[PDB]
Amino acid sequence: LSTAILKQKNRPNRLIVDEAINEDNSVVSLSQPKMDELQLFRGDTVLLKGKKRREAVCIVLSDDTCSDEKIRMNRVVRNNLRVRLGDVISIQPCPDVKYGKRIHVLPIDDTVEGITGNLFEVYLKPYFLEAYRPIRKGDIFLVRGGMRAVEFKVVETDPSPYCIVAPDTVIHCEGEPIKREDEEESLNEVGYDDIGGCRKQLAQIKEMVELPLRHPALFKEIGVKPPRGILLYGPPGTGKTLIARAVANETGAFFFLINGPEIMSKLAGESESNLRKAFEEAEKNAPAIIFIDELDAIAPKREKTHGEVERRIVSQLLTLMDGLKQRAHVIVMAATNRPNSIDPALRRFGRFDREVDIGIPDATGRLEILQIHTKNMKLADDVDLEQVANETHGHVGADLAALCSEAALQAIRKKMDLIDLEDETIDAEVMNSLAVTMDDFRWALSQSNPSALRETVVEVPQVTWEDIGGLEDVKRELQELVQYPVEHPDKFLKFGMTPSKGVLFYGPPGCGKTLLAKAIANECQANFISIKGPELLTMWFGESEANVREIFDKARQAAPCVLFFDQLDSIAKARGGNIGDGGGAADRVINQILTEMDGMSTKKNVFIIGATNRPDIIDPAILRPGRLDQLIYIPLPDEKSRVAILKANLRKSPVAKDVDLEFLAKMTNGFSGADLTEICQRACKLAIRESIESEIRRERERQPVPEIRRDHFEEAMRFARRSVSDNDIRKYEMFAQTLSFRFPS
Amino acid sequence: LSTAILKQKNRPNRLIVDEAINEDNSVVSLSQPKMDELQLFRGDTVLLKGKKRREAVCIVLSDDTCSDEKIRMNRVVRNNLRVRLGDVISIQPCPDVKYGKRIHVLPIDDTVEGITGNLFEVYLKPYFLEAYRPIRKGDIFLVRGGMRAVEFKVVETDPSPYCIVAPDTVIHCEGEPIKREDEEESLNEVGYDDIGGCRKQLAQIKEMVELPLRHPALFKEIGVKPPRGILLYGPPGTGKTLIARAVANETGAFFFLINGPEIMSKLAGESESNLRKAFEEAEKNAPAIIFIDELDAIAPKREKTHGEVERRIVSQLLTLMDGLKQRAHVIVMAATNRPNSIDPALRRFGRFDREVDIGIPDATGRLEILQIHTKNMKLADDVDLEQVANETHGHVGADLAALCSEAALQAIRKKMDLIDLEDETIDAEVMNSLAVTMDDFRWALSQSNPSALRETVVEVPQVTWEDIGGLEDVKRELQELVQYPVEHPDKFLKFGMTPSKGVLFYGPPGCGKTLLAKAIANECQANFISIKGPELLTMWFGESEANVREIFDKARQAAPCVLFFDQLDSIAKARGGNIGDGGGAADRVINQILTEMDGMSTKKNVFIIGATNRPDIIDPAILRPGRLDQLIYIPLPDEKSRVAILKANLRKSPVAKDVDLEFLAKMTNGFSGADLTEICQRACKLAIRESIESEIRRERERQPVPEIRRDHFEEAMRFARRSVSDNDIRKYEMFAQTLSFRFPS
Ligand SMILES: Cc1cc(OCc2nnc(SC3CCCC3)n2-c2cccnc2)ccc1-c1ccc(S(C)(=O)=O)cc1
Ligand SMILES: Cc1cc(OCc2nnc(SC3CCCC3)n2-c2cccnc2)ccc1-c1ccc(S(C)(=O)=O)cc1
Ligand SMILES: Nc1ncnc2c1ncn2[C@@H]1O[C@H](COP(=O)(O)OP(=O)(O)OP(=O)(O)O)[C@@H](O)[C@H]1O
Ligand SMILES: Nc1ncnc2c1ncn2[C@@H]1O[C@H](COP(=O)(O)OP(=O)(O)OP(=O)(O)O)[C@@H](O)[C@H]1O
Ligand SMILES: Nc1ncnc2c1ncn2[C@@H]1O[C@H](COP(=O)(O)OP(=O)(O)OP(=O)(O)O)[C@@H](O)[C@H]1O
Ligand SMILES: Nc1ncnc2c1ncn2[C@@H]1O[C@H](COP(=O)(O)OP(=O)(O)OP(=O)(O)O)[C@@H](O)[C@H]1O
Ligand SMILES: [Mg+2]
Ligand SMILES: [Mg+2]
Ligand SMILES: [Mg+2]
Ligand SMILES: [Mg+2]
Numbered sequence A, B: 001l002s003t004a005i006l007k008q009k010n011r012p013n014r015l016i017v018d019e020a021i022n023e024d025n026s027v028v029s030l031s032q033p034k035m036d037e038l039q040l041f042r043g044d045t046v047l048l049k050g051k052k053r054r055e056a057v058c059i060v061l062s063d064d065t066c067s068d069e070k071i072r073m074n075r076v077v078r079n080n081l082r083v084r085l086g087d088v089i090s091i092q093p094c095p096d097v098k099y100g101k102r103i104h105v106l107p108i109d110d111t112v113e114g115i116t117g118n119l120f121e122v123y124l125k126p127y128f129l130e131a132y133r134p135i136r137k138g139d140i141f142l143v144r145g146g147m148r149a150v151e152f153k154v155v156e157t158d159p160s161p162y163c164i165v166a167p168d169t170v171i172h173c174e175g176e177p178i179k180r181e182d183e184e185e186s187l188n189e190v191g192y193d194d195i196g197g198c199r200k201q202l203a204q205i206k207e208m209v210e211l212p213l214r215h216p217a218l219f220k221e222i223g224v225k226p227p228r229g230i231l232l233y234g235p236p237g238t239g240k241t242l243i244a245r246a247v248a249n250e251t252g253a254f255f256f257l258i259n260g261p262e263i264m265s266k267l268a269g270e271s272e273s274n275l276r277k278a279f280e281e282a283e284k285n286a287p288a289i290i291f292i293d294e295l296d297a298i299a300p301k302r303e304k305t306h307g308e309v310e311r312r313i314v315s316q317l318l319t320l321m322d323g324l325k326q327r328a329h330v331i332v333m334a335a336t337n338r339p340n341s342i343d344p345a346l347r348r349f350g351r352f353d354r355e356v357d358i359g360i361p362d363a364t365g366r367l368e369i370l371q372i373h374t375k376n377m378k379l380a381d382d383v384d385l386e387q388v389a390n391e392t393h394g395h396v397g398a399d400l401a402a403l404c405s406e407a408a409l410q411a412i413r414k415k416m417d418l419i420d421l422e423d424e425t426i427d428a429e430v431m432n433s434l435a436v437t438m439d440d441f442r443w444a445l446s447q448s449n450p451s452a453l454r455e456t457v458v459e460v461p462q463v464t465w466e467d468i469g470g471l472e473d474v475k476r477e478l479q480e481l482v483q484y485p486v487e488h489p490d491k492f493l494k495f496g497m498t499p500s501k502g503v504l505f506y507g508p509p510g511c512g513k514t515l516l517a518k519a520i521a522n523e524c525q526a527n528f529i530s531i532k533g534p535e536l537l538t539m540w541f542g543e544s545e546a547n548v549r550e551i552f553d554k555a556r557q558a559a560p561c562v563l564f565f566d567q568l569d570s571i572a573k574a575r576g577g578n579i580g581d582g583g584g585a586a587d588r589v590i591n592q593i594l595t596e597m598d599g600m601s602t603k604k605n606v607f608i609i610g611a612t613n614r615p616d617i618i619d620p621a622i623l624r625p626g627r628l629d630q631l632i633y634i635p636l637p638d639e640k641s642r643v644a645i646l647k648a649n650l651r652k653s654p655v656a657k658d659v660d661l662e663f664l665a666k667m668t669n670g671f672s673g674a675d676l677t678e679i680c681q682r683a684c685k686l687a688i689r690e691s692i693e694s695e696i697r698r699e700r701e702r703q704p705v706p707e708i709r710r711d712h713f714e715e716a717m718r719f720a721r722r723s724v725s726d727n728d729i730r731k732y733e734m735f736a737q738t739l740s741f742r743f744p745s
Helices: A032-038 A075-080 A119-127 A180-187 A199-214 A216-221 A240-250 A260-264 A270-284 A308-323 A363-373 A385-390 A397-413 A428-433 A438-447 A472-487 A489-495 A513-523 A533-541 A547-557 A570-574 A588-600 A639-649 A661-667 A673-702 A710-719 A726-737 B032-038 B075-080 B119-127 B180-187 B199-214 B216-221 B240-250 B260-264 B270-284 B308-323 B363-373 B385-390 B397-413 B428-433 B438-447 B472-487 B489-495 B513-523 B533-541 B547-557 B570-574 B588-600 B639-649 B661-667 B673-702 B710-719 B726-737
Strands: A014-019 A027-030 A045-049 A055-062 A070-073 A088-093 A102-107 A134-136 A140-143 A150-158 A162-164 A170-172 A229-233 A254-259 A288-293 A330-336 A354-357 A502-506 A527-531 A561-565 A606-612 A630-633 B014-019 B027-030 B045-049 B055-062 B070-073 B088-093 B102-107 B134-136 B140-143 B150-158 B162-164 B170-172 B229-233 B254-259 B288-293 B330-336 B354-357 B502-506 B527-531 B561-565 B606-612 B630-633
Touching: A027 A032, A032 A055, A055 A075, A055 A134, A075 A140, A119 A140, A119 A150, A119 A170, A134 A150, A150 A162, A199 A216, A199 A229, A199 A240, A199 A288, A199 A330, A199 A354, A229 A240, A240 A254, A240 A288, A240 A330, A254 A260, A254 A270, A260 A270, A260 B308, A270 A288, A270 A308, A270 A330, A308 B308, A363 A385, A363 A397, A385 A438, A397 A438, A397 B199, A472 A489, A472 A513, A472 A630, A502 A513, A513 A527, A513 A561, A513 A606, A527 A547, A533 A570, A533 A588, A533 B588, A547 A561, A547 A588, A547 A606, A588 A606, A630 A726, A639 A661, A639 A673, A661 A673, A661 A710, A673 A710, A673 B472, A673 B489, B027 B032, B032 B055, B055 B075, B055 B134, B075 B140, B119 B140, B119 B150, B119 B170, B134 B150, B150 B162, B199 B216, B199 B229, B199 B240, B199 B288, B199 B330, B199 B354, B229 B240, B240 B254, B240 B288, B240 B330, B254 B260, B254 B270, B260 B270, B270 B288, B270 B308, B270 B330, B363 B385, B363 B397, B385 B438, B397 B438, B472 B489, B472 B513, B472 B630, B502 B513, B513 B527, B513 B561, B513 B606, B527 B547, B533 B570, B533 B588, B547 B561, B547 B588, B547 B606, B588 B606, B630 B726, B639 B661, B639 B673, B661 B673, B661 B710, B673 B710
Parallel strands: A014 A070, A027 A055, A102 A170, A229 A330, A229 A354, A254 A288, A288 A330, A502 A606, A502 A630, A527 A561, A561 A606, B014 B070, B027 B055, B102 B170, B229 B330, B229 B354, B254 B288, B288 B330, B502 B606, B502 B630, B527 B561, B561 B606
Antiparallel strands: A014 A088, A027 A070, A045 A055, A045 A088, A102 A150, A134 A162, A140 A150, B014 B088, B027 B070, B045 B055, B045 B088, B102 B150, B134 B162, B140 B150
16 A cells, blocks of 8 residues: 555554653553563663654563553653643663763753753652662653752763663762753754645555665565665745755664855865765765755756856756665665656656655645644634634645734734834733634634745546436446446456547537546546636637646646646637637647547546537547547536536535425526526525625614525526527537447347 | 734823923923823923934923923923924933033034134033033034023033032033034935834834834744845835934944945955945844845845856855854844845745835825925915815836926026025025925926836725716625625635635726725725736737736735726737637737736735626636626716716816706716716816817907806817717627526425
């Protein structure tokens, strides 16, 4: 499975973090069956591993009230392992822990601010007297006594790293106090849990980076060599640098970070020296990871570069990439937001040959990002991260971070009156009053401008079959065409028939062709790419055929994908229709589409769908085998289908049950689904106007309309008119006709 | 609220500057309830803070004639705090002011010009004998005695900064006299009060620059990180450098100024060293502000740059921007008049991610600029800064400064006869006679050429509903469509209807579609962007579709905004109308408009309005949902509406009450609003010609017409003719028609 590597295992060592009844900063409690399963004795020293490279040592004890799958755990060592209640930690035996020869500790600034007494005698000596506490370098532990409990950081141990505080162990705390800034920076370091909406990408990165270095013998045994170059790409602000930081803080391998402007800001001969030194340092500390952030800064296209030194730097990078012998256990990672700007030589074999797309997050992904970014943010109960996530189409993670910052700024604006710039300090009542409400998020949404609105949307559509009324035979035919090869390929192989991978929807406008394409993409849970008429017209007017290939390339990277071409006749009408131009049924954009379809015919998991309201003026070459060779007529709905359409459109609108949708459908004989949606929208508009006017009337008098009613629908049927005439219907009929026989008995 | 930070608070310490009855240069007087509220004793030394970083010390005394909210204040210490009568200052206790050990003072040049006696004995000793005056470094104080009072500047104090002049304090005044040029430069330093028309921008700058450095704990508590990079952009002469100077003179943080030509004029390796030294200096003196004026000079687009050293400088700037850790408390500000010319990498996250638009001022803003620039200018009573401000469309602050300079030059030209170049001095009668009159401003206006006339105008229209006659149902429909979603969004959410965000006005020409768009923009107080037919035609002829997106980008930065597309049929007529060309209802510019409308559909506070006189030849794709899907017919006015139109057009023209506008309206059956305006304009022209000829006749005889009359309107009705024929009206009628039913009982 694609994300099977992200699965952490149901193992006896894995334990759920639980609160501690009576536990000091040196012990943890487990259930007796858990010690029996783990062969752990009471009083044994045990090593605990948690999130973000964190390790600690404790004393394992028995607790009859402790669950088998849980470990009792006080707050101090929870802070040490950077874990919260309900998190999962790993417990192992920690043998051969020797008595400490000498330990150097340092207090935290605010815990010692105002403390002038002897730290040793007041705090450390009673805390470490006849206790034999196990400690680790970098541990943070809180000590009682004095007027005020003081937190200390174990900055040095001998023997290292783990030592027992014996009575003869020399403890000293003389040195520069550990500042709170360092502790906060260490606490807020980025791990994998700080990335949202990139579950596929995280799994792929672990498979291609962490796994080969973690277990090289795994790939050696099966006789394959792991890729050497992984290139992260995506639009700016998608989290490539954040993923780099997470990998750096989460990896056991040696990590070296290289920035583009880092290298390019140095003098000629120092950039090359730094690059070579980085590669040599990685090779010396194998297994190692080299991350080159902003690769396009150092390696643009060599021919399109004018600097001599720049070309020399690109050549040096190519040579260093080729210098790895696949036993150096060095994996080079790179991030760029302009993958095309990279020199193509770097994308060859033995180089950055693997590519991971950190794309634009969907609604679930951006909800995850919002939850991550607001986890340490003071919020109110009215804040619905659901609603913000649904309303932030086109936002990337950086845009969502800016949105949260602007919401907080609006929250501060709401308290501006109690806050003065000239004031040396801010009252604590204002401080604890400060919270980010839903109104602040709404204002930030109103003021936010997304950076990825012009990017092509590649996602699974929300439209399902309940969103479509009628068309049951069309639904069954689409399901067969798209899913039978997927679900029963052996049946197609047995009869020797290659399935058709292209369908054209044709019919009157507003009958559900776009809905059908979206729904068939949704049922298969495949990505959906929609190319509308204005985009084809943009390529036609600008004479920019070459962009068509780009579209198909996206469909390849997004497979399984449904490539949908809506309004294939847009260029045909733009030329004037059937008799508009002297030329006949051949244009540049559709020609490139034909070539790209022929190229895509070998990609099994990309299904191409076309839609047109004017099948007569469509280029016939698109209906040839290997192209949209299946044809489905989407007709005007009949009365039952019209009832279904009216019911589907009114699901989200409160409608009184006295309204009879069957009569509405039977009276709208020649109406399309779009016309019925227009009727429903106008009825809702009338109801909203009535409710607003009634609320205004009451708001005046002090100084109704809960549902749409039958009079609303009648007043909507004033303006309702059928968009498709009988002429058009008949034209589709002779198109369908122009698409008895028995064997002798 | 957006400008809530600019609100300075109603606080007891805040005091209105008032004149002093009997106060020396060392005391201030307050009301007894004010001391009781502030817990201030009589004789206490008090610190006073004013505009432009100014501080001073005085002795607080009681005055029964002093108002509670006012402080009595002599002229000398008003000059010290750089404040005038009616200004607001802050008063606080100033404890632990020690006796001065040694003070060094220096006189002002003209106050000591011609003074050869001992300054100490004549002036300072009687002024500081048994007085115990509190003084500050940099104080300016005037001393009596001699033949002539002398101003002195306290250039050194010990102890510093505040000291008491004790009897044993050693006062000396031996040194280079403080020149008047230095004092004048210090006096005329730019503060926030020197910027006009940038109230939003000043509030935003204080929120994003002054606030994070002022109170970092405010952002730390709410768990957000303040932006690191703020980029000021706008057309040249809008005051970005002036805002930089104001921030430098108004900020408590350390300020470092970097200029583009500053850095780029140095040799290779010295520019980079200066940039790194600036960043290190800012980090050492945190909190600090780095301002990089003319950022485009040092950081153009790297690919579009050919210099090796230039690319290295851009990379170094990127590295320095990334080097900040958000605890360095360093905020980097930059100003550029070519924001697109900036390398895009500098506009990413962790870099110049916030942008403030110092745009073209409106009439109120340029009135503020004129008042600021002429505050120290000798003006006459006929000068109406109102009238200059209304007449300077397209002017930026620099243009207004040049206008004032040219007006002063014309004033000097008017006195040229009494002024000779060869003269060694100019008579004082000419000096005090020199004043800038309204005629000088009129001449400067005639000779002024604005630098921002070709920029897109983004402002709230002056047109209101009184400016429009009739169209009451259209006014109500527009108000509903535009304001009901804004005022009552919960009603739309309850019924599940997404409001239409696009309307198309159609009808005969000259009936008020542009007026309706402007008025609906004005009622909501939203920005208005008008795209006329010639602009669309310019994009069509030049095949420059890509500029359309620019327009929509403006609408995003100006939200809440009304985007108005006037004469959508201009390209359609240019192609020849309905049958002009073989192609049908599809062109490049309207195609880009469709794509941009689809992109803008997610921006709630941008409303798009289209207008056309030929709805038949409009591309139908623009009427689809998500586009201008609402349609409003603006018909020819009826008789009552024509009376209203004639009344509205004649509001600003003196009309005799014998004129009957009802008869004019009833006789002009098929006239449009433009035709009625033509009639009114021709009548005014006839009246003006009559009045001019009568004035000429009297001016001849020596060596009438106060209002428009009925004969004027009759002679105008000579040439008045209806622009719209019945053919066109009927065409609109079958367009409207082509846009009984009851539920069963
Ligand atoms: C069995 C088969 C399956 C196939 O592909 C299956 C498939 N997977 N995803 C998709 S679509 C994607 C998923 C949902 C939306 C997008 N498909 C697919 C392909 C074509 C039509 N429908 C479905 C191709 C070709 C064949 C075969 C049949 C016969 C022969 S032989 C030797 O001439 O006898 C050779 C090859
Ligand atoms: C309530 C709502 C308001 C809105 O926007 C309000 C708005 N603010 N400024 C403007 S315009 C600007 C101000 C004056 C001139 C320019 N508008 C606005 C937008 C559209 C039409 N009229 C006004 C958008 C969309 C909605 C909504 C309705 C229903 C649903 S749901 C879940 O399907 O039920 C979802 C969303
Ligand atoms: N998927 C995500 N989950 C959580 N936070 C994210 C995500 N994507 C971006 N962010 C946040 O938004 C910002 C994006 O900055 P980051 O450096 O990670 O982006 P980038 O794509 O590497 O940048 P660029 O391509 O412009 O160099 C960071 O503050 C990061 O924490
Ligand atoms: N069968 C249907 N069930 C539900 N809604 C429908 C149906 N047919 C049409 N509609 C509605 O009509 C509108 C447009 O439908 P859609 O985009 O799928 O049509 P189309 O055939 O591609 O034609 P067009 O060129 O008008 O877009 C939407 O509001 C959609 O909900
Ligand atoms: N809003 C304003 N209020 C007051 N004075 C202004 C304003 N805008 C400009 N000025 C004045 O006009 C001149 C504009 O020069 P300034 O250096 O401030 O402009 P700029 O926009 O930074 O310049 P450029 O973009 O060409 O570098 C100055 O003399 C300034 O005092
Ligand atoms: N109802 C009206 N009330 C007042 N003035 C009106 C009215 N209708 C038209 N006018 C006048 O007609 C002139 C042009 O009007 P406007 O620009 O709004 O019309 P339009 O419908 O957009 O047509 P056009 O293509 O002629 O500009 C202006 O002088 C305007 O004052
Ligand atoms: Mg990055
Ligand atoms: Mg559609
Ligand atoms: Mg400047
Ligand atoms: Mg007009």
